[PDB]
Design a protein around this motif. Structure first.
Motif, PDB file in Angstrom:
ATOM      1  N   UNK A   1      -1.336   5.498 -11.070  1.00 17.18           N
ATOM      2  CA  UNK A   1      -2.466   5.012 -10.292  1.00 17.18           C
ATOM      3  C   UNK A   1      -2.087   3.762  -9.498  1.00 17.18           C
ATOM      4  N   UNK A   2      -2.897   3.471  -8.475  1.00 18.14           N
ATOM      5  CA  UNK A   2      -2.611   2.347  -7.586  1.00 18.14           C
ATOM      6  C   UNK A   2      -2.739   1.012  -8.309  1.00 18.14           C
TER       7      UNK A   2
ATOM      8  N   UNK B   1       0.828  -1.201   0.000  1.00 18.74           N
ATOM      9  CA  UNK B   1       0.000   0.000   0.000  1.00 18.74           C
ATOM     10  C   UNK B   1       0.865   1.256   0.000  1.00 18.74           C
TER      11      UNK B   1
ATOM     12  N   UNK C   1       1.374   6.845  -6.582  1.00  9.84           N
ATOM     13  CA  UNK C   1       0.478   7.991  -6.718  1.00  9.84           C
ATOM     14  C   UNK C   1       1.257   9.299  -6.706  1.00  9.84           C
TER      15      UNK C   1
ATOM     16  N   UNK D   1       1.232   4.172  -2.721  1.00  9.49           N
ATOM     17  CA  UNK D   1       1.164   5.579  -2.349  1.00  9.49           C
ATOM     18  C   UNK D   1       2.225   6.358  -3.110  1.00  9.49           C
TER      19      UNK D   1
END
Ligand SMILES: *[C@@H]1O[C@H](CO[C@@H]2O[C@@H](C)[C@@H](O)[C@@H](O)[C@@H]2O)[C@@H](O[C@@H]2O[C@H](CO)[C@@H](O)[C@H](O)[C@H]2NC(C)=O)[C@H](O)[C@H]1NC(C)=O
Ligand SMILES: *[C@@H]1O[C@H](CO)[C@@H](O[C@@H]2O[C@H](CO)[C@@H](O)[C@H](O)[C@H]2NC(C)=O)[C@H](O)[C@H]1NC(C)=O
Ligand SMILES: *[C@@H]1O[C@H](CO)[C@@H](O)[C@H](O)[C@H]1NC(C)=O
Lengths: 100, 85
Positions: free
Chosen positions: A56-57, A44, A51, A48
Motif C-alpha cells: 500500500x501507498x 508518488x 502498489x 505507485x
C-alpha cells in the motif's frame, strides 16, 4: 588488410540516449514509454511501484526518508563494488578480447 | 508468405492537463490515501480520479482508506472527506 570500422553511434550519443531515458523515467515514471510523458512527483511514482508489488501507498509515505536513505546507500555500494571488483565488467571485456 | 503480421491494438493516452496533486488528505487528524486513483485539484477543489483517464470524483470514505495521522506524510494537505452516512 584487417581494419576496424567505427560504430555508427558514438559513445556521446549513447550517453545522451541513456540520459534521456533516465530523465523520462525519473520525471514521468512509465508513462513516457507508452505515450506522452506525464509529469509526476517521484515519491508518488515510488508509491505507485509499491502498489505494483502489492504494498500500500501508506507504507511508503510513512517511510519515505528511510526508503530514500536505503536507495542512496545502495547506489553508493553499487558504485564502490563496480570500482573495487577486479572482474565486474567481464562480459564486455571478454567480447573485446575474443575479437582481438 | 514467409512470416506473420501482428496488428497490435493499443491504448495511447492523450490530451493531458496540469493538476496539483497531494500524497494524502488530512481530515479530522487522519491521513486518507486513495484506494485506486490519485488526488488532484483544478485549483480550488480537491477530487480523486482514476489513473489513465481524467474522471474527477468527490473524495469520500469509500474511495479512500485511513492510515495513521497527518504527522509523518510529507506534502499532506487539508481537505474535507465526505461521509455518505
Ligand atoms: C492544514 O491543517 C493543519 C491542522 O489544522 C487543523 O485543520 C484545519 C483545517 C483547521 O480545522 C484547524 O483548526 C485544525 O487544527 C494546520 O496546522 C496548523 O497550523 C497553524 C498555523 O499554520 C497552527 O497554529 C496550528 O496549531 C496547526 N494545527 C495543529 C493541529 O497543529 C496546517 O497549517 C494546515 N495547512 C495549510 C497549508 O494551511
Ligand atoms: C473545480 O471543479 C469544481 C467542480 O465541483 C468547480 O466547482 C463548481 O463549479 C461549478 C461551475 O460554476 C458550480 O456550479 C459549482 O457549484 C461548483 N462547486 C462548488 C462545490 O463550489 C470549481 O469551480 C473548479 N475550479 C476551477 C478553478 O476550475
Ligand atoms: C502542464 O504544466 C507545464 C508547466 O510548465 C506546462 O508547460 C504544460 O503545458 C502544462 N500542460 C497542459 C496540458 O496544460
Amino acid at each position: 588488410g584487417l581494419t576496424v570500422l567505427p560504430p555508427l553511434l558514438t559513445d556521446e550519443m549513447i550517453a545522451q540516449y541513456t540520459s534521456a531515458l533516465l530523465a523520462g523515467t525519473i520525471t514521468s515514471g512509465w508513462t513516457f514509454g507508452a505515450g506522452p510523458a506525464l509529469q509526476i512527483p517521484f515519491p508518488m511514482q515510488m508509491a505507485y511501484r509499491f502498489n505494483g508489488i502489492g504494498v500500500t501507498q501508506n507504507v511508503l509515505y510513512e517511510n519515505q526518508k528511510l526508503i530514500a536513505n536505503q536507495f542512496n546507500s545502495a547506489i553508493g555500494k553499487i558504485q564502490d563494488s563496480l570500482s573495487s571488483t577486479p572482474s565486474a565488467l567481464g562480459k564486455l571485456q571478454d567480447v573485446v578480447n575474443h575479437n582481438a | 508468405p514467409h512470416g506473420v503480421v501482428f496488428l497490435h491494438v493499443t491504448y495511447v493516452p492523450a490530451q493531458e492537463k496540469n493538476f496539483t496533486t497531494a500524497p494524502a488528505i488530512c481530515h479530522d487528524g487522519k491521513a486518507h490515501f486513495p484506494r485506486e486513483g490519485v488526488f488532484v485539484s483544478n485549483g480550488t477543489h480537491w477530487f480523486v480520479t482514476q489513473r489513465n483517464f481524467y474522471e474527477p470524483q468527490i473524495i469520500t470514505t469509500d474511495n479512500t482508506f485511513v492510515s495513521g495521522n497527518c504527522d509523518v506524510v510529507i506534502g499532506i494537505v487539508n481537505n474535507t472527506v465526505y461521509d455518505p452516512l
